Structure formats: structure tokens, C-alpha cells
Amino acid sequence: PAHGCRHVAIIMDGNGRWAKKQGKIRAFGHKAGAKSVRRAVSFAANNGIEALTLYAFSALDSEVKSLHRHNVRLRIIGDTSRFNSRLQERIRKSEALTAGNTGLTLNIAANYGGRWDIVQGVRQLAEKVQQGNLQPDQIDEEMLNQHVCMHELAPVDLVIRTGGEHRISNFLLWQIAYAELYFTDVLWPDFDEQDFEGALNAFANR
């Protein structure tokens, strides 16, 4: 924690382009990006990062065993409701397995949108209104902040986007109010331990 960064969020763009530059099809890029994911997760866990939130931008897993091993707590954020029910149980089971883990919290955005995220936290507040439990004039920023995804973690300190586009693309919105935004042209499958080091270094400075 020289870098002092508790919660990094990453928009992992560039898989497709990475594959095309090599004359390979899209699928090769995705497999390469998966390897980049494991590399990043390791890095975060070995550098005292408290939370890493990953957004795969334009799937599945046997990593859970390995994550659970490294005391990583796994959370899926997004609208899982529509997922075919086998999928939902698998997610639930992976979350329940690692729920008591105390190392890195790894949030993996799936069918996630920043606006959806805010909207659903609004529903909850609007729920506790109808129950007559809370007044409409009582709603403040801290309030609505306790009902959006990852309210329980440290605030997002750093958002990295690879692949060259300079936009949020409906990823976290409420939660990035004060975050450092770091954009790199590096494509996601080449984004390595030094690039991640590069990013944290730049967060340090203000």
C-alpha cells in the first residue's frame, strides 16, 4: 500500500482487436483475455488491493476452486435474474463458497449497467417507502449509497480502461464520482503486471 489503492475497477477492452491484429478469430482473443484476467487477479491479491471489479466489455469458469484457495471472496454484480437457472445456482454456489473469505474481494460484472445499478437501489429505497418505514425527504446521498452495488467495499479509487476508448460505457457511475480514471491503448490480453504497476503509480500522484 505505498500506492494506497484499495479498490481498482477495470474495463477489459481490446480482446477482439488483439486477435485480429494477429489474423486470428475473436475466440482466441477471449482466451488470451482470460489469461490476462488471472494474471490481474493474482497481481491485485499480491499487492494488497482490497477489491478488484472487472467489467468484460464487447464466458464461464473453473477458477472458483483456485480463487477459494487464495482466500478470494467472489461476487457477481449485475442482473443475474434472467440467466438460465442452472447458471444462477452455480453463481449462488460459488458466492456462498467464498462468502466467508477474507482476502481480495473480486467483483465480476455480468449483465451489469451503471444506470441499472442505481435504479435497483432506488427500487429498494422505494420498497422501504411503501412499507411506511422511511420518509421521502429523508433520502440522502449516504443513503442511496448504501443500496448500490459494492457499498460494503472500499470506494473505487482507480478505474482502468484498456483498448483505447475513452469512455465509461455504462459501467460504474455512482461509484466513480471521485475515482481516478486511467485510460490506456494497451489491449486487454497484453495488459500485464508492469501495465498494472504503471496504473497504480499514476494513481499515487495528485
Added chain:
Amino acid sequence: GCRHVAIIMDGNGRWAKKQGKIRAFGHKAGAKSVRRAVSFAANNGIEALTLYAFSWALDSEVKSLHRHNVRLRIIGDTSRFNSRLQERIRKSEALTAGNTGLTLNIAANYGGRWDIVQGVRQLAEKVQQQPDQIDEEMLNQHVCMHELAPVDLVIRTGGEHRISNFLLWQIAYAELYFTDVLWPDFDEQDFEGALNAFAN
């Protein structure tokens, strides 16, 4: 086609410091840079320019803006502002409300989070009298600037790479452009550079 630009105008104080001057002199060179940006936007067919002053002028500039066919709006929490200022804002907005050129939104005591929370306070008062009908489009209709073109481009001068609680909901799909140029120095050429970035 860039329709709505939003600017986080940072670096006035640092500019003053850099010039061997006190803070107030940075604030006057900042005001000039506002006038330059406003003319530029109007001159290049931008529909909406939203300006966030980041680390009172109505009677000085309102007549010129009206002349120039600019519609003025203030966004932010002005509830705790003097009653006279509130009347002037109202008057100024009313005076320019039919102008057909640039819409200039000035963000005064504004916060992105505050803007959503105050949109949330609205729906929650109507819930007190359907919490499966509050969806994205419904909340969008209660956030600032919903009736205008969506923000295409957010410019932040002064070398910081953050949004600093400016538009949040509104910038979901905007291009974000960060420049080390300090606001008082941000000119037409710099504005073009940013429009170029948006074009690619």
C-alpha cells in the same frame, strides 16, 4: 456530430500561481475563457454547452447572451441562495427561454450524486402517494437536462483525471477528454482538439 459538450473548468488558481498572481486574477482570466468557449460553441453549431465551475454574473452578461440567441439555464442546488439571486436566475432564465441558439447550462452548487438523489426524492414522494415501474427511462426523466441532447463529450482542463462528482448519470456514454491545459489558457484550438478526438 457532437451535440452537447460539458466542461470541468479546472486550473484557474494554478494559473494565477503560475503567473505570480493572486487567486482573484485567475478568476478573471477564467471568466474570459468562459466567454471564448461560449462563442466558440455557438459558432460551431453545438446545441448545448454545460459548464462546471470547480477548484453573481447575471446582470453583467445576461443581456449579451440574449442578444446572441443563447438560452440560459442554471443547474444545481440553489435553494439556499439569496432570494434576490434566485429571482435573478428565474428572470434570466425566463428572458432567454425562447432563444433558439446554444443552450448554456451553468452548474452552480451542483453535484452528480445530488442530482440523482434529488431525482430519487421525487419518485419516492410519488411512491408515498409501483416500485416495479421505476426503470431507467423513468429516472432519466427526473435528472437534470433530460430534455436536451445527451452529453457527447466531457472536457476536463487542468490535468486532473476525474469526474469529481459532476454529471454521472448523464455521462454514461460520453467521450471523456482530459487535457493538462489550464482553464484560462483553454482556447479555440484546444476546443477543436477535443472535438477532433470526439470525431475519431
